[PDB]
């Protein structure tokens, strides 16, 4: 997570707000000074130094983690950006459009913007390239794993923060006294943009016994709940038949059409796109729009604020209306009780913010503050005719103190307890603290329970006994968290391997088409989803697609969901295929692969280096999250549930499940446990609260936490 952050997310944050433009108007009393200036400061490539420390007297020298721990320094490295300074002048002729040209004062030039704290054993740290003897020379423990920061000499671990996933439609039943029966909400977020959260709620008013059950949606920057038919007409789908085609995908779903009839009753007296846009613009909350600009105001709300996770550009009103109709469709299935309300405790609907996303949003906030200070200083200098100094334009102490304060005290801002002092009681205590996760807690859910989707991803019995019971979770041993990849290559691959665009999708002439979602964004439909899923899984098993990408085929709902975002907790599983030679299902991994792994291991303790990446590359193992775990069948062990069917009475009673259609196999079931629970001998012969108590108390043991 830290390597992904430093390698790409820093540059992404710089390049989103790379340029900053200030225009000085002529302010000309006489026509002799009819020139307008345009000063642009542009950020470019970002560079990171090796971890260093500057002393009092200006001496800057390489800082090592042992010296930082001893001297109470921050194990940080400097960040530099390329700054190029464009300046433009124009003849300020009124009426004539201004045309700017360079005066060739294009100065450019690395300048210091702050110190990023470096997590140990990352690609920037000195201990990554160090051998074991080099670690002994540097007085670092070879058993020490890293994973933590050194802030003022204190080892700080960034606890993973559990959050509900964005860009997912979640439908909920409200309370009985409320006039709204069901709410379909999406917390729409975009990763390559302003990172702002917009909540779109599509609410069904009136209870089950009521008659006038209308549906209204809460648009952003709109003070009232706009009816969905009015929103559809503002998006440009006028006829009632076309609106019900966007919402309901079956012509025989007269239950759904009967529930949708009061919506067009409510929205009947608006029959024009500009009438609907004027309605939404009157309900605009800015209250600074004139009479004739409300149409454009509502268009800008529908383009830039309504469902931003789909797009920010114009010309995608059809895509946004299809997504709105899908939201209303899910709301109506839950209202008709064809599906229940979505589970808040489903772990595939959750994301875990590791050190990458947390420092990413923190550095994004701090860099917005830095660029605001740059613009403020530059405006003050050009207004008061002072000299411009870039060392005063950039306050590096902003970034440095922000990162240092948020890593020293767990307050993530300007959420508490995000960063804690690393536990150094025992080695297992340090491992458990480094793999610890946290869930903030006031909703109507029950997040403290051990959910079904927690299998193999978090430990079933490792949690505090106090107020943090169930909220503080610990990762299972083989469980990992995805760092996030770009969905655009997969979207392009879908578009050229048969996913037709949503703009040309007509639901009544494509009743069997499967909807395709990428990171929660409906991009189109596919006629034949099975072979598309086959070739996508073949790419992921051969390594062409990143194995962290999760691909789910819901055959019953006719959906194909692809998730490439960060925060998804996945675990590795064996792959079971047809194996027509032996005539029965069998694991793809064989004794030859096991021998190659053992040969590599014993060479490490001359043949080819056969590794975990190799097993992943010819696809004997697969990365499965809780969402992809819903569409697979897993065998617990290979040599009993794979081959077709006197017993020892001492052995435990085990079922064979009487089903041979397996797609995956557990590697070993002991890996559902965490670090502290894997110390427990025979934990399946214990009562589970006593395993929880030992998982708590193993961190208070005495051993040798580190050899140094």
């Amino acid at each position: 997570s830290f390597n992904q952050f430093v390698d790409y997310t820093l540059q992404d944050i710089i390049c989103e707000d790379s340029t900053l433009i200030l225009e000085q108007l002529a302010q000309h009393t006489t026509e002799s000074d009819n020139i307008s200036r345009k000063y642009e400061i542009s950020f470019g490539k970002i560079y990171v130094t090796k971890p260093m420390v500057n002393e009092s007297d200006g001496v800057t020298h390489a800082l090592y983690p042992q010296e930082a721990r001893l001297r109470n320094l921050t194990y940080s490295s400097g960040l530099f950006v390329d700054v190029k300074k464009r300046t433009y002048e124009a003849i300020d002729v009124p009426g004539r459009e201004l045309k700017y040209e360079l005066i060739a004062e294009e100065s450019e030039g690395k300048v210091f913007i702050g110190r990023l704290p470096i997590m140990l054993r990352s690609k920037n740290c000195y201990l990554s390239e160090a051998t074991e003897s080099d670690l002994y020379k540097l007085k670092e423990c070879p058993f020490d794993m890293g994973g933590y920061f050194i802030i003022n000499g204190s080892e700080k671990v960034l606890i993973a923060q559990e959050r509900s996933a964005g860009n997912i439609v979640q439908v909920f039943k409200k309370a009985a006294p409320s006039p709204i029966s069901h709410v379909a909400e999406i917390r729409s977020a975009l990763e390559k943009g302003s990172r702002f959260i917009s909540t779109l709620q599509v609410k069904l008013y009136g209870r089950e016994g009521s008659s006038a059950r209308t549906i209204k949606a809460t648009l952003p920057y709109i003070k009232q709940d706009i009816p969905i038919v009015i929103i559809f007409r503002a998006l440009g789908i006028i006829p009632d038949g076309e609106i019900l085609e966007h919402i309901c995908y079956d012509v025989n779903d007269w239950q759904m059409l009967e529930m949708l009839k009061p919506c067009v009753e409510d929205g009947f007296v608006i029959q024009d796109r500009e009438t609907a846009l004027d309605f939404i613009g009157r309900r605009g909350t800015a209250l600074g729009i004139k009479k004739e600009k409300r149409i454009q105001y509502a268009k800008d709300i529908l383009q830039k604020e309504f469902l931003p996770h789909i797009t920010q550009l114009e010309g995608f009103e059809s895509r946004k209306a299809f997504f709105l109709g899908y939201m209303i469709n899910r709301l109506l299935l839950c209202a008709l009780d064809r599906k229940d309300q979505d589970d808040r405790d489903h772990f595939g609907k959750k994301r875990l913010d590791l050190a990458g996303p947390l420092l990413a949003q923190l550095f994004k906030t701090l860099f917005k503050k830095l660029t605001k200070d740059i613009f403020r200083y530059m405006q003050r200098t050009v207004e008061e005719a002072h000299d411009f100094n870039m060392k005063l334009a950039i306050n590096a102490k902003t970034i440095t103190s922000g990162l240092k304060y948020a890593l020293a005290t767990g307050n993530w801002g300007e959420r508490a307890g995000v960063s804690q002092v690393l536990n150094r009681y025992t080695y297992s205590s340090t491992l458990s603290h480094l793999r610890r996760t946290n869930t903030p807690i006031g909703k109507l859910a029950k997040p403290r329970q051990l959910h079904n989707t927690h299998w193999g991803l978090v430990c079933p019995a490792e949690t505090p006994e106090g107020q943090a019971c169930g909220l503080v979770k610990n990762l299972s041993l083989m469980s990992c968290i995805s760092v996030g990849t770009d969905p655009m290559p997969i979207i392009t691959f879908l578009s050229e391997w048969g996913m037709e665009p949503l703009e040309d999708y007509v639901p009544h002439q494509s009743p069997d088409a499967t909807r395709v979602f990428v990171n929660g964004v409906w991009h189109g439909v596919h006629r034949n989803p099975a072979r598309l899923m086959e070739t996508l899984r073949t790419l992921r098993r051969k390594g062409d697609i990143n194995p962290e990408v999760s691909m789910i085929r819901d055959i019953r709902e006719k959906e194909l969901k692809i998730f490439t975002d960060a925060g998804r907790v996945y675990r590795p599983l064996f792959i079971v295929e047809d194996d027509e030679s032996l005539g029965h299902k069998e694991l793809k991994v064989r004794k030859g692969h096991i021998a190659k792994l053992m040969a590599t291991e014993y060479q490490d303790i001359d043949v080819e280096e056969y590794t975990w990446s190799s097993l992943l590359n010819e696809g004997l193992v697969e990365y499965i999250d809780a969402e992809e775990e819903e569409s697979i069948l897993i065998a617990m062990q290979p040599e009993d549930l794979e081959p077709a069917e006197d017993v020892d009475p001492a052995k435990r009673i085990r079922v064979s499940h009487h089903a041979t259609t397996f797609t995956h196999c557990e590697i070993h079931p002991s890996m559902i446990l965490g670090v502290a629970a894997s110390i427990i001998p025979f934990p399946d012969h214990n009562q589970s609260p006593r395993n929880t108590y030992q998982s708590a108390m193993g961190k208070q043991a005495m051993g040798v936490f580190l050899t140094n």
Binding site: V421, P464, E465, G466, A696, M697, Q700
Partner: peptide, 24 residues
Amino acid sequence: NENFEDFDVEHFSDEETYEEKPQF
């Protein structure tokens, strides 16, 4: 300071519940 996993119950600490449920 201290950081212990042994949950010693904070006695005479009912005001957390009082602030949790102040309205009736």
